[PDB]
Short mmCIF file of C-alpha atoms in Angstrom, two decimals:
data_model
loop_
_atom_site.label_atom_id
_atom_site.label_comp_id
_atom_site.label_asym_id
_atom_site.label_seq_id
_atom_site.Cartn_x
_atom_site.Cartn_y
_atom_site.Cartn_z
CA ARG A 1 -22.32 -58.44 114.03
CA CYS A 2 -19.91 -58.73 111.73
CA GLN A 3 -16.55 -60.86 110.60
CA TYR A 4 -17.15 -62.48 107.25
CA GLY A 5 -16.50 -60.18 104.51
CA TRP A 6 -16.05 -57.24 106.41
CA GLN A 7 -12.25 -56.15 107.70
CA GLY A 8 -10.92 -52.97 109.21
CA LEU A 9 -10.16 -51.51 112.55
CA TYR A 10 -13.58 -52.18 113.36
CA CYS A 11 -16.04 -52.73 110.50
CA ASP A 12 -16.24 -50.65 107.60
CA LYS A 13 -14.67 -52.32 104.36
CA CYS A 14 -15.78 -55.08 102.14
CA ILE A 15 -12.18 -55.89 100.98
CA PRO A 16 -12.28 -54.02 97.70
CA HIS A 17 -8.63 -55.17 96.59
CA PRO A 18 -10.09 -58.37 96.09
CA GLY A 19 -12.46 -57.72 92.57
CA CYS A 20 -11.46 -54.26 92.42
CA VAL A 21 -9.12 -51.13 92.62
CA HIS A 22 -10.75 -48.21 94.13
CA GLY A 23 -13.86 -46.76 95.12
CA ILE A 24 -16.15 -47.70 98.15
CA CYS A 25 -19.18 -50.07 98.99
CA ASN A 26 -21.64 -50.99 101.05
CA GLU A 27 -22.26 -54.75 100.82
CA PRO A 28 -20.13 -57.69 100.98
CA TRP A 29 -18.01 -58.68 97.87
CA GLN A 30 -19.10 -55.63 95.51
CA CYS A 31 -17.63 -52.90 93.66
CA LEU A 32 -19.16 -49.20 93.47
CA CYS A 33 -17.36 -46.80 91.55
CA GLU A 34 -18.41 -43.81 89.55
CA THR A 35 -18.90 -42.99 85.85
CA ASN A 36 -15.39 -42.18 85.13
CA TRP A 37 -14.33 -45.28 85.90
CA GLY A 38 -14.98 -48.30 83.50
CA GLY A 39 -14.92 -51.96 84.03
CA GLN A 40 -16.22 -53.98 87.08
CA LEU A 41 -12.71 -53.17 88.53
CA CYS A 42 -13.01 -49.68 88.23
CA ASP A 43 -9.48 -48.78 87.86
CA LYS A 44 -7.61 -45.66 85.76
#
């Protein structure tokens, strides 16, 4: 069901660390943040 690019207690995280700092994501290896955040990594 999932293993590559999906960690966590079960499966609900595309490891935002490697490539980003905060925010969310729905696909493997991606970066999704708000508009206030600048840059792909979406940091402060």
